[PDB]
Amino acid sequence: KIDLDLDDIQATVLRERPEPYYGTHAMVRFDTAEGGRELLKRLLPHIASAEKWWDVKYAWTAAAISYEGLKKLGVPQDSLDSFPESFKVGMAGRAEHLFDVGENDPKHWEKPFGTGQVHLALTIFAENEENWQKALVIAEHELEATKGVTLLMREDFGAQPDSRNSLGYKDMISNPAIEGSGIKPFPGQGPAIKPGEFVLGYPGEAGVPLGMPKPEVLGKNGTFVALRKYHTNAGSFNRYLKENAEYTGGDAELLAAKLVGRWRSGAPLTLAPKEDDPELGHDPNRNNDFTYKNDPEGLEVPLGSHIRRMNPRDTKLELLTDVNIHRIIRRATAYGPAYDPKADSLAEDKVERGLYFIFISAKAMDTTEFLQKEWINKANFIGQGSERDPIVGLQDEDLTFTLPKEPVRQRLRGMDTFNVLRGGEYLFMPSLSALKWLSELK
Ligand code: HEM
Ligand SMILES: [Mg+2]
Ligand SMILES: [Mg+2]
Ligand SMILES: [Mg+2]
């Protein structure tokens, strides 16, 4: 059944990223309360809802608002107080619960981020360059027309060869299935998570709705967003694959597969353990149909590989854990020059490429802080001590990655931080009704 008011929920909460994809991220500041309210009234016609999210849509526009954004809009103090504390503090201010330290410390963040300047994040997704522009010109026009707001930054994304990300992996394969979305999960995508884990106003896994913003028109059919921008050091990554390829029989593509858990083509190593299977990788009805019940030792998908860290499935962990409450919906967008596998100079790390991530969840701040602190930058849950995620963890050359083989558990060292945080924000992705309410304040 459809249990979700799809016509009130923003499209981005349920729509997969288009294939191929083009778009733009835009960070906006509200100079005056009335400027903010007006921008929303002008954008609101162009914010698509999640109606028939399984159908084709050549472009849609998303909007998500920071605490500072809500404050400036004039949201009353008793409504501001109903948002979680983490959201109030903002992402930079919560760096300690995110292990955003070292290279990722907020003092190094790119300009708009981490300062409270970002009030409104606008994202345009599109499947061809023509509808990207059509929606872009519409966005730019309404911005120009709104005195009282200024566009802080703007960056285009997508147009990647074969849609691969900034390290050449097929991304956007595994996202949680939502009970009540109207669509049965792809094989191996189950189980359908209770809808209140991802949309406010609805029961979660524990049977009751999560704490949500007040009044009901502001919080219902909304959700929370963790937006993070990374810079990718593909030079360092490439040199790492070459240096350590001896440990996977000279095959650098197998080593790239062991660090993520999937070949760059998308095939998971549980379904393609010895050689790539690019047709498997491209097929949504095949590329996710697996668990780890027959791989308890990480011989196929290593325990500390990226996808297995982020979604352990039936892996035995240290402490009891309901994986269902630690899921996140991801929208990844690669930006910058396309990834090149032969490029391994030091200067390749200086090419401005990377990823934007929009992580969506009714408790997005909690789950992002949880994943960052417990499953990316530690390995106690998998019994590998201080090993950290090879793709996005804050690496130290003397930390290791354990690559299980026959009959020896090989250890690798000398990793650099391959994806460096350039900034981020905790945002609130409001319902279509809540957006209208915000535009009619005061
Ligand atoms: C920063 C650079 C990152 C890169 C290059 C990257 C890349 C990937 C790739 C290639 C996959 C496999 C494709 C797929 O399963 O859809 C994946 C899966 C996943 N990643 Fe990341 N990712 C990054 C950051 C993050 C972060 C910060 C998080 C969470 C805090 C995250 C959470 C996940 C999850 C939940 C999955 C799905 C696992 C599953 O259901 O099997 N990723 N990522
Ligand atoms: Mg949307
Ligand atoms: Mg490259
Ligand atoms: Mg960059």
Mutate to test the pocket of ligand 1, among 173, 310, 369 (most ligand atoms within 8 A of CB): 310
Q: What are phi and psi of 295, to 5 degrees?
A: -130, 45
If phi > 0 it is left, if psi is from -120 to 50 it is alpha, else beta; for residue 341 that is alpha
> Shortest CA distance to 313 belongs to which of 330, 285, 294?
294
The closest ligand to the CA of 124 turns out to be: 2
The number of C-alpha atoms within 13 Å of 388 and in the hemisphere containing its C-beta is 20
- For the chain, the C-alpha Rg in angstroms (whole number) is 21
Pocket of ligand 1 contains residue 389 by CB under 6 Å: no
Residues 6+ away with beta carbon under 8 Å from 308: 261, 292, 298, 301, 302, 315, 382
The number of C-alpha atoms within 13 Å of 295 and in the hemisphere containing its C-beta is 25
Amino acid letter, residue 293: K
Q: How far apart (Å, rounded) are the C-alpha atoms in residues 442 and 439?
A: 9
Pocket of ligand 1 contains residue 355 by CB under 6 Å: yes
Pocket of ligand 1 contains residue 328 by CB under 6 Å: yes
Q: What are phi and psi of 254, to 5 degrees?
A: -65, -35
Method: X-ray
Amino acid letter, residue 98: L
The pair of three-digit structure tokens given for residue 194, joined into one six-digit string: 């209770």
- Kindly give the interhelix angle for 252-260 and 234-244, rounded to the nearest 10 degrees: 110
> Of all atoms in ligand 1, which is nearest to the CA of residue 172?
16
Report the sign of the C-alpha dihedral through residues 74, 75, 76, 77, in that order: negative
Are 434 and 217 contacting, i.e. CB atoms less than 8 angstroms apart?
Answer: yes
> Shortest CA distance to 276 belongs to which of 295, 298, 293, 260?
260
Are 276 and 295 contacting, i.e. CB atoms less than 8 angstroms apart?
Answer: no
Strand bridging mode 192-193 / 419-429 = unpaired
CA of 247 to the centre of ligand 4 (A): 30
Q: How far apart (Å, rounded) are the C-alpha atoms in residues 108 and 99?
A: 14
**How many other C-beta atoms lie within 10 A of the C-beta of residue 318?**
10
Q: How far apart (Å, rounded) are the C-alpha atoms in residues 368 and 328?
A: 8
The closest ligand to the CA of 46 turns out to be: 2
The number of C-alpha atoms within 13 Å of 136 and in the hemisphere containing its C-beta is 18
Q: What's the 3-state SS for the chain? A: CECCCCCCCEHHHCCCCCCCCEEEEEEEEECCHHHHHHHHHHHHHHCCECCCCCCCCCEEEEEEECHHHHHHHCCCHHHHCCCCHHHHHCCHHHHHHHCCCHHHCHHHCCCCCCCCCCCEEEEEEECCHHHHHHHHHHHHHHHHCCCCEEEEEEEEEECCHHHCCCCCCCCCCCCCEECCECCCCCCCCCCEECHHHCCCCCECCCCCECCCCCCHHHHCCCEEEEEEEEEECHHHHHHHHHHHHHHHCCCHHHHHHHHHCECCCCCECCCCCCCCCHHHHHCCCCCCCCCCCCCCCCCCCCCCCHHHHHCCCCCCCCCCCCHHHHCCEEEEEEECCCCCCCCCCCHHHHCCCEEEEEEEECCHHHHHHHHHHHHHCCCHHHCCCCCCCCCCCCCCCCCCEEEECCCCEEEECCCCCCEEEEEEEEEEECCHHHHHHHHCCC
Pocket of ligand 1 contains residue 234 by CB under 6 Å: no
CA of 251 to the centre of ligand 2 (A): 41
Are 88 and 426 contacting, i.e. CB atoms less than 8 angstroms apart?
Answer: no
Q: How far apart (Å, rounded) are the C-alpha atoms in residues 195 and 67?
A: 24
Amino acid letter, residue 157: F
Residues 6+ away with beta carbon under 8 Å from 88: 67, 80
Q: How far apart (Å, rounded) are the C-alpha atoms in residues 35 and 14?
A: 29
CA of 303 to the centre of ligand 4 (A): 29
Are 239 and 362 contacting, i.e. CB atoms less than 8 angstroms apart?
Answer: no
CA of 372 to the centre of ligand 1 (A): 12
Closest C-alpha to ligand 1, atom 33 = 310
Hey, which residues does 150 pair with through a beta bridge? Answer: 29
**How many other C-beta atoms lie within 10 A of the C-beta of residue 259?**
25
The pair of three-digit structure tokens given for residue 40, joined into one six-digit string: 């929303």
Q: How far apart (Å, rounded) are the C-alpha atoms in residues 260 and 188?
A: 18
Buried (b) or exposed (e) across 159-198, using 16+ Cβ within 10 A? Answer: ebeebbbbbbbbbbbbbbbbbbbeeebbebbeebbbbbbb
Pocket of ligand 1 contains residue 365 by CB under 6 Å: no
The closest ligand to the CA of 338 turns out to be: 3
Report the sign of the C-alpha dihedral through residues 177, 182, 183, 184, in that order: positive
Pocket of ligand 1 contains residue 4 by CB under 6 Å: no
